[PDB]
Symmetry: C2
Subunit: 846 residues, 2 copies
């Protein structure tokens, strides 16, 4: 039950010359047949291939000071940003990795950064050693990401990154980690490496590698950053990762005693090729493509070609000629990153099912025996013949100038076992949310512009995939935005709206907060005929509604009563929609730090908090609302825009609620009200459709009777902190007896007071759990008084009791920082390749 | 499989140049703290010879040696030493799947614009890029397994050791070199840690002491040779200990890249026990990262308490220590250093001690009494298993951690030992070699110093180790000895350049060896009877006896002569001595013969079967007997009655044999006694190589007419024709013209000399022609050497062992495994490196 388990490549990232800043841009360069040879930049201080942004670093993203960033070797910084991008390609939000066996293996050597004396002004003392010692290149990644498997920096020159891959594959097979980042980085800071190869006469004047060409006259120095994410195939499939290829086998060895430390030996190259085949249990006939070391040196190219001839050339059998190429023909010699660059080239190929081409410049080298016809240069895009197995495979080679050699077999990934897919809460409406996050607003804007450009340049991409990917395969940062969209084109328009600062429907913006969420249960006038009907397909919701039907009939003979009103029906139905909407938020991941209610709302809130069972909570609102129909006739209520005290004629009307700084309820005698009302026809007052006045003495008649009816209820300790609008503070759920429920009907509702307290205590998000926003505007006004940044949210709305509205609410709750379990909401779609985090890099170059 | 440590080597501060010196420094409670050297540029711990390097040894230019990072030079010389500790002649590893794993980081060498006068242009980069530190060992030594350099700061060499083991388990290589080297060339590292305030002003690491106040910086080489236990046992290597389990993890998010985390340390310790299939109770010793940091040491102690301190259950407190207390923080070699320290202990069966200073840190919960500081030497309790174990930690400042369980080597499955070729006589040869004469004397003195300081080590172990477990270089010397005192005495002679009995000196050479077969008077009564115990010899005498019985009656008449018996018996002794040389490794490039000796030479070369050769010498001899009585031959010192004596053989520039009629010889002798010309008769009544034998011709040529001359598998150089003969030319005629034409031996030795042969071996019971050959070589101004085999009144195993040693000193290939068999590998000084200082 143990063997060389296949290792899977689940992500990849690279920064390479020729303006390549992602695997996909590398594909463009290779199919274009453009190269990157250009003159050395002046901004370094002393022809070749150079990275666009070698010295740019989003230092603030990773919490690194600008002084330390200036001291960090540009290789340390590329490795750190490219590691991040690789995990994003694997679809792993890097936070989930903190405390993980994840290992880091970085191939690298020294390139002459920070060799002068430190200009004291720059103030890099205390940072320069750590910014430039090899082990830190790998240790820093594990520090910044909280990774806890092995972290090593390895130097074998040109093969460094393939040796790092080889080591990570053993680490994974051995149990030393369960996920690994492996790759290499180089940035030619100083001119020492270029100078030594010039002196040797090893560099083409072009700056271009002409691999296997008659025009080969030396290699072109390059640089870059190339990283893959490795995982044992079993763990990959079990976690449903998107496998890009697999390392079927790999090998490492040494030239030994060649003719000069740098001299190449074809025999060594053959043996390393053959150990790889052995580890992978294949023969050369099973490999259609070879991505060679391929540096364009007159004497080395034939050495490499003779060993391919002696290995891949023989017994090709059924398999036609082997295709041969080298990515150095487009980007130059990327030194410590050369190997994995090659590996990312063949992986791009596997995606598209074709053999990646090479910039063939001129005629084949006359020094190579092509007479067998068994090796062909990959001149343009070609068919990738599977092997007799039906498996496509490639071979990648890196032969370092210190004599250590590597060869790796990359194979297409096996077919995944199909698994039963999880269900998506909320019926499908074609509308999908697409969420964005960055560490600043400029970065947030840039993310949105890039997603829009990608989706415009890549249409046909399934919006469900962009939705799932940006919610499940990306980390959520401080500054957020979300865009509802029914089809790709509507996404681009609204993503551009985020990008350019436009307010537009279907687009929301917000900052994520530490503080808790408070569920506001209003009651009052949240009802509308036909409410929340479109949510009865949702089992979480429908089930709550059904159990509510059971216990209502037993206590009031009533039920759904919305297949197609009056106070002792409306209140038992608004109770039911509110505890149901609450359970729906719960099952979508919004967990309440506290519950608060307005009058009857407090009964749904006590249920939602666990202080009263669903049964007792129904009985309390059924026999509280039957008891109010018994003091009908005389009595009514009115809303009065304008704050209390100013509204505070006596003995017939009194203040019965306070809802915000600019909103009060007054109640008392029916006629007496019309009096106040038509008085104000000359304040924006308005009367509530009521035949009685609660929170007044008109209710003392039903006291004792109510208290009795609800004497069998059993208040329990709450699971969620219940804030009493009566007491004005937190209250053990045992204290919610009939007395409390009478005193709730009689005493005045100090709701503005409670919202002020909860704002004082630092709660961040108020979610009105109701079929129509009733208190939301009043709460929003209270927060403006306290000059607060707390956010207020509705759930459903009249003409909006649909899933599309709850989806909108989920989108806004998440944008404010409420934890939406997007897995439970958008089930589990596939991972699509979308732009990475939009690093806001500044230049640092000592 | 378990990976075995089969060799080990280290250069460390405190004058430590070998694992034994480490044991010295550690058991005598001294430390190496001292001021920074002046000669480096710019308090700590420093290697004595950090900039010394034997560039000529590795064939490296002095300019390239100047450009090379001392870290690269030390790694090269220490890798050699570790290979010698393994008993592996490094040349036998050329073309081998041997892996090189080098832990290392940058340390400030070559940081300034180089003085053009230095001439480093073109070597600086190669001599300072990290990959070349391991790539160059693979290059110099021809190794072909993986070669990596790795940097995980203070854990580098244990991570290196961890990677090698996985490489060995994976079949990626079959032997690995692993370790770490650091040399504080410039002061950067020192300045940084000073600024941070982590460096004790003492320069001294005080691990787990209340007096801890920072660590002291240090440097070092520490390397071990690794091999799968199966393969080590097969090759019969000496296992110092086994890497039962190793683990590597990272601190992740500690309170700073440098901050230590105990959970991280606990987890890596427990992964290593899982790989090794043990629990903390089974480990008696922990060698720690130590350092002596006020805040670091308690994190390490807390993690050790939570693993090695829990659930010991009547196994006693684990012992605790850190070699940094004696040598400081070797940085990249800190780990293997600690490994070598616990290996030193495993040898002697005691827990190696630590220089504990002051009182135990009050920052540490000693209250369970389950962890005890390794005060002085202690008993190493084995575990219930019965296996002695130790744990070694190295925790990197980049946050990478390693813990390694070192265990005692398992008991070797015993195996029947190969037989020695020669009968044992308590006399052993100990052979010496190095690249220059100076180095040879140096190796001699260090072996004498070593033997003086460890008496009662067996001479047969010294013999076997020096002959089979070291490479043999250009300048050689051999010493014969029957006890250690005598070896010491003669080894001093070699060291002092003095001439003494028992001691031979010489230079190995490219040319081949010629087996020289005389006839003459090599015989003596009872010759070689002492070699009959040796099967290869006995079997050949016995097979001669048979063929001679069917051509005469005599046989093994070497117990309790005349011509038709002596020439047959000399023949059987020479061809048997030839077979003994060959079973001992000596390949003849060519054979040459003097008269009847050519028959021996033709049989040794395969041109005649043993029978046809016996037959030729038996008849040829009887032929002489027939035409005897009158006639005589005499030796005459001088270069080369007229028709009554002629020259019958020219043996050298000053030696001639004159033969003729018996009376005319008596006349030539009296004249010589008068005129003073040195001459003496040869006890014979015949005159061979004159017309005196013509009579018995046309008779032997008929008796030897059924001989079957075959083609020779060894070039036969005809003294007769003075050039190379196909063995099918060796017909009866030849064997007659051999008896009648005069022996032009001197001319043949000149000829072979001019073809570049290097070594002449007289395959005879007594060296008849050897002094003449030397005379011939002296005049050609030739550096070639002349060797004998047996000797009149010696002729036993001792004289043959002596001959083997002299042939080895001159370049002849002696098997040594065939002559000595297996014996014990013992630790003896390494190659005597002759380093000049290099430093930019």
């Amino acid at each position: 039950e143990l063997e060389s388990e296949p290792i899977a490549i689940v992500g990849m990232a690279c920064r390479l010359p020729g303006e390549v800043d992602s695997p996909e841009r590398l594909w463009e360069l290779i199919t274009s047949g453009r190269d990157s040879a250009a003159e050395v930049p002046d901004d370094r201080g002393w022809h070749g291939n150079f990275m666009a942004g070698a010295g740019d670093f989003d230092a603030a993203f990773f919490g690194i000071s600008p002084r330390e960033a200036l001291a960090m070797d540009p290789q340390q910084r590329q490795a750190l940003e490219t590691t991040w991008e690789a995990l994003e390609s694997a679809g792993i939000p890097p936070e989930t990795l903190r405390g993980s066996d994840t290992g880091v293996f970085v191939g690298m050597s020294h390139q002459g950064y920070a060799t002068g004396r430190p200009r004291p002004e720059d103030g890099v003392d205390g940072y320069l050693l750590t910014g430039n010692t090899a082990s830190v290149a790998s240790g820093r990644i594990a520090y910044v990401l909280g990774l806890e498997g092995p972290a090593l920096t390895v130097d074998t020159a040109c093969s460094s990154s393939l040796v790092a891959l080889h080591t990570a594959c053993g680490s994974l097979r051995d149990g030393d980690c369960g996920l690994a980042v492996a790759g290499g980085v180089s940035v030619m800071a100083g001119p020492e490496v270029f100078t030594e190869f010039s002196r040797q006469g090893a560099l083409s004047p072009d700056g271009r590698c002409k691999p296997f060409s008659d025009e080969a006259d030396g290699f072109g120095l390059g640089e870059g950053s190339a990283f893959v994410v490795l995982q044992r195939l079993s763990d990959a499939r079990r976690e449903g990762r998107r496998v890009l290829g697999v390392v079927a086998g790999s090998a490492v060895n040494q030239d030994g005693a060649s003719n000069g430390l740098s001299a190449p030996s074809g025999v060594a190259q053959q043996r390393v090729i053959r150990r790889a085949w052995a580890r992978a249990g294949i023969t050369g006939a099973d490999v259609a493509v070879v991505e060679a070391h391929g540096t364009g040196t007159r004497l080395g190219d034939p050495v490499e070609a003779s060993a391919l001839l002696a290995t891949y050339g023989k017994s090709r059998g059924s398999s036609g000629p082997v295709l041969l190429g080298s990515v150095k023909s487009n980007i130059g010699h990327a030194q410590a990153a050369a190997g994995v660059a090659g590996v990312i080239k063949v992986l791009l190929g596997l995606e598209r099912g074709v053999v990646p081409p090479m910039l063939c410049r001129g005629e084949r080298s006359g020094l190579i025996d092509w007479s067998s016809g068994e090796i062909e240069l990959a001149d343009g895009v070609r068919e990738w013949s599977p092997a007799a197995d039906g498996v496509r495979r490639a071979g990648v080679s890196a032969f370092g100038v210190s004599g250590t050699n590597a060869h790796v077999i990359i194979a297409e990934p096996p077919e995944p076992e199909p698994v039963p897919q999880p269900r998506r809460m909320l019926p499908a409406t074609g509308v999908v949310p697409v969420v964005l996050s960055a560490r600043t607003g400029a970065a947030l804007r840039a993310q949105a512009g890039r997603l829009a450009d990608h989706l415009a340049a890549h249409p046909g991409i399934a919006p469900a995939d962009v939705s799932w990917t940006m919610a499940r395969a990306r980390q959520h940062f401080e500054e957020r935005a979300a865009v509802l969209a029914a089809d790709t084109a509507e996404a681009v328009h609204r993503l551009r709206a985020v990008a350019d600062g436009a307010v537009v429907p279907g687009v929301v913006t917000g900052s994520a907060s530490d503080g808790g969420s408070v569920f506001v249960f209003p009651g009052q006038g949240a009802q509308w005929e036909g409410m929340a009907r479109e949510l009865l397909p949702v089992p979480v919701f429908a089930e709550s509604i059904a159990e509510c039907d059971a216990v209502l009939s037993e206590v009031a003979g009533f039920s759904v009563s919305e297949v197609l009103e009056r106070v002792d029906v409306v209140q038992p139905v608004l109770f039911a929609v509110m505890v149901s909407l609450a359970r729906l938020w719960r099952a979508c991941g919004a967990v309440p730090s506290a519950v608060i209610g307005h009058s009857q709302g407090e009964i749904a809130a006590a249920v939602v908090a666990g202080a009263l069972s669903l049964e007792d909570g129904m009985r309390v609102v059924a026999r509280r609302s039957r008891a109010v129909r018994a003091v009908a006739g005389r009595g009514s209520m009115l809303s009065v825009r304008g704050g209390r005290s100013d509204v505070e004629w006596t003995g017939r009307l009194e203040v019965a609620a306070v809802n915000g700084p600019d909103a009060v309820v007054v109640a008392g005698d029916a006629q007496a009200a019309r009096e106040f009302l038509e008085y104000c026809e000359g304040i924006r007052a308005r009367a509530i459709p009521v035949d009685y006045a609660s929170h007044t003495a008109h209710v003392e008649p039903v006291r004792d009777e109510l208290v009795q009816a609800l004497a069998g209820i059993t208040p329990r300790r709450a699971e969620v902190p219940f804030f009493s609008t009566l007491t004005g503070d937190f209250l053990d759920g045992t204290e919610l007896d009939a007395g409390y429920w009478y005193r709730n009907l009689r005493h005045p509702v100090e709701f503005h007071s409670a919202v002020q307290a909860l704002t004082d205590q630092g709660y961040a998000t108020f979610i009105e759990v109701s079929p129509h926003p009733v208190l939301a505007s009043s709460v929003q006004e209270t927060l403006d008084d306290a000059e607060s940044d707390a956010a207020v949210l509705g759930t459903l709305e009249r003409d909006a009791g649909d899933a599309d509205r709850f989806l909108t609410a989920l989108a806004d709750a998440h944008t404010r920082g409420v934890a939406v379990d997007w897995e439970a909401v958008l089930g589990r779609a596939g991972l699509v390749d979308l732009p990475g985090y939009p690093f806001q890099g500044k230049r640092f170059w000592l």
